[PDB]
Design a protein around this ligand. Sequence first.
Ligand SMILES: Cc1noc(C)c1-c1cc(O)cc(CN2CCC(F)(F)CC2)c1
Length: 127
Amino acid sequence: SMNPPPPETSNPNKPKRQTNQLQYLLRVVLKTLWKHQFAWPFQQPVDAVKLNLPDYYKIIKTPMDMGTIKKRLENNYYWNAQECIQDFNTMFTNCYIYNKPGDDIVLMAEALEKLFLQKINELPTEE
Ligand SMILES: Cc1noc(C)c1-c1cc(O)cc(CN2CCC(F)(F)CC2)c1
């Protein structure tokens, strides 16, 4: 169970724009979660080899992580905020699907998700 390639973070064919909602997602939302004490397991793709999780990529077919999200934001990969929000949701859902409801990693993801929802509650209107 080698790891898959990471999710793409740039694509020369995918259209680009800089907007204030995407800026908010990078500067406020991602920033807040990134620097949180629970961020670190989520700051890069799950390395199922180093973590000895041979079934991870049998269960999780749409991996996602904040490192990927950060690069996507930095690279103007997203056209709109919803695309980015979807990736955060994917990351949290994967964690909840793969792990058991007691688990420390799940509590960590719940805390980040609560914070995520607070910051997305205040997304600015598009200029
Ligand atoms: C995210 C994610 N989703 O599913 C898995 C499995 C991971 C995961 C990713 C990591 O980079 C490291 C660990 C180990 N874990 C960290 C927190 C802890 F609470 F300390 C327990 C050990 C788990």
